[PDB]
Tab-separated table of N, CA and C and ligand atoms in Angstrom:
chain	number	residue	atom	x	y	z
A	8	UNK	N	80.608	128.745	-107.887
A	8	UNK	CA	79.907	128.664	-109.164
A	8	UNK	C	80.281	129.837	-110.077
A	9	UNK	N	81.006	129.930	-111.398
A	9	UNK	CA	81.121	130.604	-112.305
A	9	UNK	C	80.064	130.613	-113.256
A	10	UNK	N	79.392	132.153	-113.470
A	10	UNK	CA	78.537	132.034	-114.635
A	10	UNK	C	79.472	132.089	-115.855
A	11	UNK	N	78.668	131.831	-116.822
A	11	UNK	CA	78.949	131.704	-118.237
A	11	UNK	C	78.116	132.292	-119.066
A	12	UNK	N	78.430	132.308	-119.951
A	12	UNK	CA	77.896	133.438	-121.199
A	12	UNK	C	77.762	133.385	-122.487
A	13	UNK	N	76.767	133.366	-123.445
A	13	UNK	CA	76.770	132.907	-124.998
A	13	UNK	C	77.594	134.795	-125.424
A	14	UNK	N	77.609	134.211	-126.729
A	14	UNK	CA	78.413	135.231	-127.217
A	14	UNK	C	77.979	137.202	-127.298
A	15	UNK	N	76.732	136.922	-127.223
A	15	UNK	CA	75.694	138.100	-127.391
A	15	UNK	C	75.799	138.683	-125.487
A	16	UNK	N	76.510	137.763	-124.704
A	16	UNK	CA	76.270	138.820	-123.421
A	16	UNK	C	74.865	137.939	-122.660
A	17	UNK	N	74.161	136.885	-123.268
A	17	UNK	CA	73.019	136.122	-121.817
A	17	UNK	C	73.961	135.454	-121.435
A	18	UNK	N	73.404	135.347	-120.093
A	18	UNK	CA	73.809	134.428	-119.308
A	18	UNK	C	73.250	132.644	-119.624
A	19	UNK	N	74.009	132.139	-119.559
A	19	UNK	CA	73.671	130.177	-119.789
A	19	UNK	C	73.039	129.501	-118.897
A	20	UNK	N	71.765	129.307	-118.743
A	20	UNK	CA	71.275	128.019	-118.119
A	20	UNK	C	70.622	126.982	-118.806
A	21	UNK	N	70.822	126.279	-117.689
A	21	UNK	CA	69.652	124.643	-117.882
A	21	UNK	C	68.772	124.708	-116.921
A	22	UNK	N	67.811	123.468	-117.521
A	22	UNK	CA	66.626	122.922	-116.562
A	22	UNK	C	66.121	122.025	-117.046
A	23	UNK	N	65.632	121.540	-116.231
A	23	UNK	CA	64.069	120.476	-116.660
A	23	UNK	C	63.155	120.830	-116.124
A	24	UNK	N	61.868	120.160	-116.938
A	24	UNK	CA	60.821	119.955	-116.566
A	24	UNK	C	60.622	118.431	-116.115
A	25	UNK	N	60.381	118.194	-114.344
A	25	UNK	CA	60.819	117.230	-113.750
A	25	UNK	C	59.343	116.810	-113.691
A	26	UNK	N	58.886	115.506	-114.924
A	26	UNK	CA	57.827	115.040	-114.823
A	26	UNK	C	57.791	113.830	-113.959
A	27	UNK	N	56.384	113.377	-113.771
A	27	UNK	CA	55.923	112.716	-112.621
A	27	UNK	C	56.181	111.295	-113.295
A	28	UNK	N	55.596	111.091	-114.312
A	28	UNK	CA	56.178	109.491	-115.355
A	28	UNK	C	56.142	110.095	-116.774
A	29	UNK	N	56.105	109.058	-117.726
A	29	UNK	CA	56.081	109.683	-118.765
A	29	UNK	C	54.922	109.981	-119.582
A	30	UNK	N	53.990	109.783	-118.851
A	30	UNK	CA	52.642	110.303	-118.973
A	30	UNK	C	52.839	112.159	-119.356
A	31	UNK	N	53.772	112.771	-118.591
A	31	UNK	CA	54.048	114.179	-118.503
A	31	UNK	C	52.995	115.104	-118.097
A	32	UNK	N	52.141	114.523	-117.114
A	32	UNK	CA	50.548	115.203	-116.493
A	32	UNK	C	50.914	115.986	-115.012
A	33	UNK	N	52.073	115.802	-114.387
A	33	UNK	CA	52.481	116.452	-113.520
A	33	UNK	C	53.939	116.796	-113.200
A	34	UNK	N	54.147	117.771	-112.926
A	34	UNK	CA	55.627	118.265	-113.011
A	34	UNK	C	56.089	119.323	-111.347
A	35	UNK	N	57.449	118.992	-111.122
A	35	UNK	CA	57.738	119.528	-110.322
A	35	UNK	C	58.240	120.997	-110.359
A	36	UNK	N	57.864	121.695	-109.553
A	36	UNK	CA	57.918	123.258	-109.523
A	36	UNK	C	59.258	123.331	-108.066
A	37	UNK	N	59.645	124.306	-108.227
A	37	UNK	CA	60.414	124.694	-106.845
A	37	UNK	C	60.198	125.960	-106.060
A	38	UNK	N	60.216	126.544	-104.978
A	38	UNK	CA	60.075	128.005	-104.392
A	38	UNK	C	61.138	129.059	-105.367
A	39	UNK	N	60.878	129.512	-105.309
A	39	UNK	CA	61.926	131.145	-105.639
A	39	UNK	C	62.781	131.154	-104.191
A	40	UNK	N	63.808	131.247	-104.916
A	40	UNK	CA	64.870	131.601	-103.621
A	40	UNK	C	65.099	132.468	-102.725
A	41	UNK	N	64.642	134.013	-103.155
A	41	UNK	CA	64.267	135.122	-102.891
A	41	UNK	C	62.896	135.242	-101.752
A	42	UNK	N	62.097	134.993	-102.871
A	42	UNK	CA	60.440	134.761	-102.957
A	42	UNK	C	59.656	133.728	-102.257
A	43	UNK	N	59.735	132.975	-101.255
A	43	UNK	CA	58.838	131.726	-101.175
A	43	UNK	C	57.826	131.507	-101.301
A	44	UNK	N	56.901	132.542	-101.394
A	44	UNK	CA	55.716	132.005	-101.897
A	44	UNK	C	55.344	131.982	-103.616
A	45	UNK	N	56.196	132.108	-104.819
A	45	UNK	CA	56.451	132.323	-105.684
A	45	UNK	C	57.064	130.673	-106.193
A	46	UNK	N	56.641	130.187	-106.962
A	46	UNK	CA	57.111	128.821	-107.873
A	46	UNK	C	57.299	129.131	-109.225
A	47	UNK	N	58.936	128.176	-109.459
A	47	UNK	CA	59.480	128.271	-110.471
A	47	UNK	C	60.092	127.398	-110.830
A	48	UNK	N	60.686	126.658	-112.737
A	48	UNK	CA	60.583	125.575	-112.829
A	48	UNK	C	62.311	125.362	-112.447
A	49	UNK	N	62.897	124.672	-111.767
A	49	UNK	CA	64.218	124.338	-110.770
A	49	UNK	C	65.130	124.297	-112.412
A	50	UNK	N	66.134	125.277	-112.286
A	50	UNK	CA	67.369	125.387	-112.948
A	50	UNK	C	68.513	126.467	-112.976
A	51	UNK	N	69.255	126.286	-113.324
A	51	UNK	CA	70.318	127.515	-113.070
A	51	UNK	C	71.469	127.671	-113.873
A	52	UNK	N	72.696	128.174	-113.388
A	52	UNK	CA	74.115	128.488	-114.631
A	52	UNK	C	74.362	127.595	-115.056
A	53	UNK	N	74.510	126.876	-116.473
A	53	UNK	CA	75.585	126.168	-116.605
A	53	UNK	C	77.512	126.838	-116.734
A	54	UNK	N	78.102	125.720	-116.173
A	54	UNK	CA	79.530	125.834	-115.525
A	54	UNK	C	80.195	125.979	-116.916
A	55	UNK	N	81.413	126.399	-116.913
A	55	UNK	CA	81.993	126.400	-117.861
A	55	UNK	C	82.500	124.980	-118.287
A	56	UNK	N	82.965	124.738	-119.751
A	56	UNK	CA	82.205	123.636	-120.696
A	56	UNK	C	81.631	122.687	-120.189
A	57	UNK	N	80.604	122.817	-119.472
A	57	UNK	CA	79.627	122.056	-119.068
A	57	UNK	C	78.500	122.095	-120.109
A	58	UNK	N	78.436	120.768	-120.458
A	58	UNK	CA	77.093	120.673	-121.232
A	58	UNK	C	75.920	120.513	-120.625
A	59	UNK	N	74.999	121.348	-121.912
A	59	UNK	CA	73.843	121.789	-121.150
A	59	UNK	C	73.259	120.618	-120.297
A	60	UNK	N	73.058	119.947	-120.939
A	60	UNK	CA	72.348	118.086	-120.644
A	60	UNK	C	72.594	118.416	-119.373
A	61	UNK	N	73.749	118.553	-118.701
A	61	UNK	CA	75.052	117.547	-117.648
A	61	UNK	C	74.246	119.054	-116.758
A	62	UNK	N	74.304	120.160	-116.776
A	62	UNK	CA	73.874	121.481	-116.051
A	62	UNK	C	72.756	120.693	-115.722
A	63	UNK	N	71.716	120.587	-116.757
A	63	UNK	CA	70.261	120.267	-116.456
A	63	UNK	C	69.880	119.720	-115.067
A	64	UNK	N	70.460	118.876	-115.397
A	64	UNK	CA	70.456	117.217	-114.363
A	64	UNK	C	71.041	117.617	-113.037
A	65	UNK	N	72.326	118.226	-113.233
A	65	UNK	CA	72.971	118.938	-111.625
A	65	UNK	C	71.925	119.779	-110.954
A	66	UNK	N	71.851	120.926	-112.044
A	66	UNK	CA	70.659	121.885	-111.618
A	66	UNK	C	69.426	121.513	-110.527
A	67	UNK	N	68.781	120.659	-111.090
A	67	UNK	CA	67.289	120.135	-110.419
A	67	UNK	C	67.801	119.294	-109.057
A	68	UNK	N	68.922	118.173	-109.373
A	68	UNK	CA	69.401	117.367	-108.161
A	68	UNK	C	69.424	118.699	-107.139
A	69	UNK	N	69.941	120.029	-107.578
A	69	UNK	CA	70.457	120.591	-105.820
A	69	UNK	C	69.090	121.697	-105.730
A	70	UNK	N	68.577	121.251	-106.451
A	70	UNK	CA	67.523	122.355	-106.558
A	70	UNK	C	66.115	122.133	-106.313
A	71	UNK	N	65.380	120.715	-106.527
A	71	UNK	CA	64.835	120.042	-106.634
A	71	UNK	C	64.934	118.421	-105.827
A	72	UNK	N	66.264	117.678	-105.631
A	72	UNK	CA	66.310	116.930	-104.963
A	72	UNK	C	65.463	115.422	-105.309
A	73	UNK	N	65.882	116.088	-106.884
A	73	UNK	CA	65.397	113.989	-107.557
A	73	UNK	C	66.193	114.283	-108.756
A	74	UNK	N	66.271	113.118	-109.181
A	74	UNK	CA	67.196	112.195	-109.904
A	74	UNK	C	66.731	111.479	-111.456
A	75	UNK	N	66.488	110.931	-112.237
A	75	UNK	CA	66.007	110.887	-113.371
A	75	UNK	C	66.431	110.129	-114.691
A	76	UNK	N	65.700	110.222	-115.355
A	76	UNK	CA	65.774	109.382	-116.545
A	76	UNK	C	65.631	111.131	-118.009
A	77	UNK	N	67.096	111.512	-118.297
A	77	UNK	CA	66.587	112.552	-119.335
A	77	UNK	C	65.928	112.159	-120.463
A	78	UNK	N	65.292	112.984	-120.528
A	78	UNK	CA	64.556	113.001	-121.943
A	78	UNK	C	65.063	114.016	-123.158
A	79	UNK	N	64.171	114.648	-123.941
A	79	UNK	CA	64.816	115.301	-124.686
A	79	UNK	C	64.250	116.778	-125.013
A	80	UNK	N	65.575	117.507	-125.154
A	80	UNK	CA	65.493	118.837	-125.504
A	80	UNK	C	64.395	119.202	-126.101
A	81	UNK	N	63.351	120.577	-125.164
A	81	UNK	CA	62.476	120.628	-125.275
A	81	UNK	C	62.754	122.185	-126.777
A	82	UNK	N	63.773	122.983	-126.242
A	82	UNK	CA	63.757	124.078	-126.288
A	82	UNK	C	64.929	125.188	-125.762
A	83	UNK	N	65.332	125.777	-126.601
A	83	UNK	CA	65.996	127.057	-125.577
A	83	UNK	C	65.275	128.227	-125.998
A	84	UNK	N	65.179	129.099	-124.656
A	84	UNK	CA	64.333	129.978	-124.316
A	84	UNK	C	65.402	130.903	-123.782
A	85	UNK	N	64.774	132.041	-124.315
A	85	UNK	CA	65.705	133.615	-123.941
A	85	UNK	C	64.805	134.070	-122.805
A	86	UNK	N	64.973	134.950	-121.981
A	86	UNK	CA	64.013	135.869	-121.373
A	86	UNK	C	65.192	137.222	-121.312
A	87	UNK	N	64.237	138.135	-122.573
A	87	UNK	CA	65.280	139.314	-123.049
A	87	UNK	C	65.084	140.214	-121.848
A	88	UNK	N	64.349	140.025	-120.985
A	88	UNK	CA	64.683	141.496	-119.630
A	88	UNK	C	65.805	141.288	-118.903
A	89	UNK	N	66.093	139.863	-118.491
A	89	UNK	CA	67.009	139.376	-117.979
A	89	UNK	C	68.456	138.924	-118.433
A	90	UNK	N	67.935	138.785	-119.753
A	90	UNK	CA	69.303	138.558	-120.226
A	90	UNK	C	69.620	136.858	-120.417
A	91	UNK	N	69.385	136.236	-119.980
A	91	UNK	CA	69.279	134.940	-119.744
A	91	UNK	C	68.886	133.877	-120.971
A	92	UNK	N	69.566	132.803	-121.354
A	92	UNK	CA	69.271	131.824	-122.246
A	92	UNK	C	69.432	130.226	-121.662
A	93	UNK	N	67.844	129.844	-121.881
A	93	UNK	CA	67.861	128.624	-120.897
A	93	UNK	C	67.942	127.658	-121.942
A	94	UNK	N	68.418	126.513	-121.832
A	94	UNK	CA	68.293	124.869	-122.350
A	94	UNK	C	67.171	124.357	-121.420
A	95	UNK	N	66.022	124.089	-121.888
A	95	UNK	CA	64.964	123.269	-120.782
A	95	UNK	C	64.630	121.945	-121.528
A	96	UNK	N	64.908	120.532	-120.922
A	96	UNK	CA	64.872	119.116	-120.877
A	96	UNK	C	63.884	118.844	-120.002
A	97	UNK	N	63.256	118.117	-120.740
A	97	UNK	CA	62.462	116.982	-120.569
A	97	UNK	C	63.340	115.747	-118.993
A	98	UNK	N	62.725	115.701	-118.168
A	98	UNK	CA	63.047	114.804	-117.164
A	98	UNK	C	62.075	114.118	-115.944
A	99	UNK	N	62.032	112.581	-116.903
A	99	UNK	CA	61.277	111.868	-115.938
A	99	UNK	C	61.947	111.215	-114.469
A	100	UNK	N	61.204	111.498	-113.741
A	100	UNK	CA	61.611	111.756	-112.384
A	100	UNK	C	61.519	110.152	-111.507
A	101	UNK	N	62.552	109.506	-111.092
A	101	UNK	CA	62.624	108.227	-111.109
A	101	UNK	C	63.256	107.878	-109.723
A	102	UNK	N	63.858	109.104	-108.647
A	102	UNK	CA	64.020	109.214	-107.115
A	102	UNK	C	64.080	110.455	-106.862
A	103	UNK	N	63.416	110.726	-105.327
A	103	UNK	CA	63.267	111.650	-104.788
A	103	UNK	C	63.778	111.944	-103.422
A	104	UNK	N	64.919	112.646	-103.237
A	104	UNK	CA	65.535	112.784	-102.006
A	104	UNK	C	65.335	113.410	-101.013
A	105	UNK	N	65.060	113.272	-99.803
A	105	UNK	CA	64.490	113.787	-99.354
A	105	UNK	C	65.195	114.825	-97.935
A	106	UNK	N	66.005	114.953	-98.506
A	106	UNK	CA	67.057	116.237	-97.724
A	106	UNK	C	67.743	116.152	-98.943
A	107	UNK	N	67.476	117.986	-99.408
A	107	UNK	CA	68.713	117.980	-100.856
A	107	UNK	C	69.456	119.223	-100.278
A	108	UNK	N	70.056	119.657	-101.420
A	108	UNK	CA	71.137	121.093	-100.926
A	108	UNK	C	70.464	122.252	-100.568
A	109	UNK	N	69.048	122.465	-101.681
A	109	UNK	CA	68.744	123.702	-101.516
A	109	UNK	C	67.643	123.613	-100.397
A	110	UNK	N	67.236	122.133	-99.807
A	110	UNK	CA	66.189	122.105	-98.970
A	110	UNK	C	67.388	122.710	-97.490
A	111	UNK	N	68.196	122.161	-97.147
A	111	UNK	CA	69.138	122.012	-96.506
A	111	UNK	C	69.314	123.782	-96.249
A	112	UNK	N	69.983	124.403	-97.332
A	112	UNK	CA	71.081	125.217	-97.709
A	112	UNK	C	69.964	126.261	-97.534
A	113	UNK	N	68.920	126.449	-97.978
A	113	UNK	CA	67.827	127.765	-98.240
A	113	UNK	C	66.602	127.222	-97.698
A	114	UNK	N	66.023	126.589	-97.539
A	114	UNK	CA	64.757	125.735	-96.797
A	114	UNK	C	63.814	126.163	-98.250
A	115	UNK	N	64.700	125.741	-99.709
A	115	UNK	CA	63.378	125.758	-101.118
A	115	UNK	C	62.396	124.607	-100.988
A	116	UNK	N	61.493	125.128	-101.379
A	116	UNK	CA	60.506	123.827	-101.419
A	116	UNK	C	60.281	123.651	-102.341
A	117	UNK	N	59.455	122.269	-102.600
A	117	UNK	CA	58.520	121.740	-104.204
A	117	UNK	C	57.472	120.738	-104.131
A	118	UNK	N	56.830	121.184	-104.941
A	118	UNK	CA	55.178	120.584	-104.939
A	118	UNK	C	55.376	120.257	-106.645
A	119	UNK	N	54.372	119.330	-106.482
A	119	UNK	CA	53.923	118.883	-107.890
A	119	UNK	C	52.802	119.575	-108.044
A	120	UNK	N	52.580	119.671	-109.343
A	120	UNK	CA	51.659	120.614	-110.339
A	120	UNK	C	51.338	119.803	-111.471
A	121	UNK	N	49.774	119.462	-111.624
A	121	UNK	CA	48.960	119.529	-112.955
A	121	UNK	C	49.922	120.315	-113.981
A	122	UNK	N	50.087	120.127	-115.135
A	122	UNK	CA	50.729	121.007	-115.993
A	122	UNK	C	49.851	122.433	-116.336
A	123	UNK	N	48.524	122.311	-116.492
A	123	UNK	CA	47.809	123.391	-116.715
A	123	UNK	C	48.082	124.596	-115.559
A	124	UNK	N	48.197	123.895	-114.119
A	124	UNK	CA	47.836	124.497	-112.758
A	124	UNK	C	49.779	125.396	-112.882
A	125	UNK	N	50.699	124.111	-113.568
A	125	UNK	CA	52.076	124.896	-113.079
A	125	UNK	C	51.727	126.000	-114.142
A	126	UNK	N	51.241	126.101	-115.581
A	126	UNK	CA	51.400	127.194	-116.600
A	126	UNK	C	50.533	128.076	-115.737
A	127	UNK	N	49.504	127.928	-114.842
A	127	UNK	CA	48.589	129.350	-113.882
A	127	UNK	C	50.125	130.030	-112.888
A	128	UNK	N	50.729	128.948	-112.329
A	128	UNK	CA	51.673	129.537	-111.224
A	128	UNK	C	52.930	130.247	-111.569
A	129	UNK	N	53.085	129.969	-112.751
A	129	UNK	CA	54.194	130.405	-113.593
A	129	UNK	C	53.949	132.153	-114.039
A	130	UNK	N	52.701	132.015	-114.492
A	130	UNK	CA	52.240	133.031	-115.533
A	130	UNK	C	52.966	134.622	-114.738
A	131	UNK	N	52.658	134.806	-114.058
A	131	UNK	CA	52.904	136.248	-113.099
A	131	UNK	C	54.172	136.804	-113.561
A	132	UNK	N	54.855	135.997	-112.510
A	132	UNK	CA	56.384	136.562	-112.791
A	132	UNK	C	57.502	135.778	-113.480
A	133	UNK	N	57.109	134.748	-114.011
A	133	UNK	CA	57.845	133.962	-114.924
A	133	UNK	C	57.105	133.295	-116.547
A	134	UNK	N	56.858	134.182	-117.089
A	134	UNK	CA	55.737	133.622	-118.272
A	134	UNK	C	56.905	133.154	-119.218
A	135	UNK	N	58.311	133.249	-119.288
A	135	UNK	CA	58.828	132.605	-120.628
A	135	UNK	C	58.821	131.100	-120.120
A	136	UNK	N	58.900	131.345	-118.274
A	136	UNK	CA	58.934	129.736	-118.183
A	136	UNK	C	57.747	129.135	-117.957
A	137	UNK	N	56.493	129.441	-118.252
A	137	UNK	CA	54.843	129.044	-118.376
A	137	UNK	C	55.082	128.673	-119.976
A	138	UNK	N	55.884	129.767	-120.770
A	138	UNK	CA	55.693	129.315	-122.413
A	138	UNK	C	56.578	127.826	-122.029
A	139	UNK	N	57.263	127.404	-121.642
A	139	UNK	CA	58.701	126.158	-121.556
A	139	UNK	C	57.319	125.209	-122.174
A	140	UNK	N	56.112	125.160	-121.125
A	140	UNK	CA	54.964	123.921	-121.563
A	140	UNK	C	54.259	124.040	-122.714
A	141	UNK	N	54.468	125.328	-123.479
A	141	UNK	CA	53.410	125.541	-124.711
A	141	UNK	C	53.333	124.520	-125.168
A	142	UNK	N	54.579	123.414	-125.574
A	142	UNK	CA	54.443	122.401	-126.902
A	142	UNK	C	54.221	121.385	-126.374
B	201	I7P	O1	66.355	137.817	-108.559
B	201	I7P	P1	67.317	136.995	-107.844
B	201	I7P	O2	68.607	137.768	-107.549
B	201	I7P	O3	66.923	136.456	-106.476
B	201	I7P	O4	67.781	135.697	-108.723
B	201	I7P	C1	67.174	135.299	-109.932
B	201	I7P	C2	68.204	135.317	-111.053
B	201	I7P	O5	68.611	136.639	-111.347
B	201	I7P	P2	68.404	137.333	-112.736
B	201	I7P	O6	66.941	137.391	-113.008
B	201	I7P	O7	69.030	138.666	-112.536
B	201	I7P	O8	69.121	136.508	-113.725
B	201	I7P	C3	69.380	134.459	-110.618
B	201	I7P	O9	70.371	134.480	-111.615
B	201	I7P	P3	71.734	135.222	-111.542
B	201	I7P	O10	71.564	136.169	-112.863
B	201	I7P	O11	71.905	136.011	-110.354
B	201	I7P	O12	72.918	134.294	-111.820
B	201	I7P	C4	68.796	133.032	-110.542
B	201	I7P	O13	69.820	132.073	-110.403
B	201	I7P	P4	69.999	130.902	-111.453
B	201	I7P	O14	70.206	131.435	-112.835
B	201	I7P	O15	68.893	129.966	-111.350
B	201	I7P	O16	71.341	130.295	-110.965
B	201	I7P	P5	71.816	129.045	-110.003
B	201	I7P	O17	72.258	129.699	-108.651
B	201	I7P	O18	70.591	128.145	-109.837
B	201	I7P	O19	72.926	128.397	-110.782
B	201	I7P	C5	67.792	132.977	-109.384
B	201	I7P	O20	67.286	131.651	-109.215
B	201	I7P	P6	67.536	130.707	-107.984
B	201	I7P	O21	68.479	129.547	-108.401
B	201	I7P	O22	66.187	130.135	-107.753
B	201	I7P	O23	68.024	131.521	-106.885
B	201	I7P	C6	66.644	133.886	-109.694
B	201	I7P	O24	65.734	133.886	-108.584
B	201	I7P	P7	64.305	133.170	-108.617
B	201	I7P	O25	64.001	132.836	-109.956
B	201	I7P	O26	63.313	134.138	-107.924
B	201	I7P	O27	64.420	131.938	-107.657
B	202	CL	CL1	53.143	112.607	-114.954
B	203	CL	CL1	62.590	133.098	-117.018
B	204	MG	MG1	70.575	126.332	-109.101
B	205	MG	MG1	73.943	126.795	-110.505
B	206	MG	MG1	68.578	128.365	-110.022
């Protein structure tokens, strides 16, 4: 995996927010890779000219381990400590696999979350991605 980089020096990711239907009342969270008892919303580098969309969707499949119907660009979000500039999509969640890479590869897990309950689990150590649900 090669990171990539906007012109200012962040680093490029994607994600979704992997909703339950399109109701959008529950969403999938993933472990911290590091961290396991720590949840966070599943995304990572996009590849070089990889569009964001196309990152999104890879992202969550190895990260998350479902599959989907995209929706639409919610937002890009900086988090200036890190350096980091995310693309976060909208994604209704339409199969769920049940041995993926990162279950496999790192033993990550994921639970579904109330949206209110994921913006509580978020808040700590990831609040730009608790803001991802503001709108
Ligand atoms: O603190 P750290 O070393 O453990 O890793 C941070 C983060 O580091 P940062 O804060 O310095 O940017 C990593 O980004 P990098 O800057 O190293 O490339 C990031 O990878 P990412 O962007 O998602 O990249 P992908 O591998 O998904 O493509 C990783 O997410 P995980 O995928 O879940 O491991 C994060 O862990 P956490 O959020 O706790 O799970
Ligand atoms: Cl839902
Ligand atoms: Cl973040
Ligand atoms: Mg990843
Ligand atoms: Mg990646
Ligand atoms: Mg990641």
């Amino acid at each position: 995996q090669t990171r990539t980089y906007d012109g200012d020096g962040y680093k490029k990711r994607a994600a979704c927010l992997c909703f339950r239907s399109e109701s959008e009342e529950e969403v999938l969270l993933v472990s911290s890779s590091r961290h396991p008892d720590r949840w966070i919303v599943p995304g990572g580098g996009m590849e070089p000219e990889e569009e964001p969309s196309v990152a999104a969707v890879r992202e969550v499949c190895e990260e998350a381990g479902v599959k989907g119907t995209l929706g639409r660009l919610v937002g890009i979000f900086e988090n200036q400590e890190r350096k980091h500039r995310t693309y976060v999509y909208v994604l209704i969640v339409t199969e769920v696999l049940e041995d993926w890479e990162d279950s496999v590869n790192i033993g990550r897990k994921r639970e579904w979350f109330k949206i209110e309950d994921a913006i509580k689990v978020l808040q700590y150590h990831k609040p730009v991605q608790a803001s991802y649900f503001e709108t």
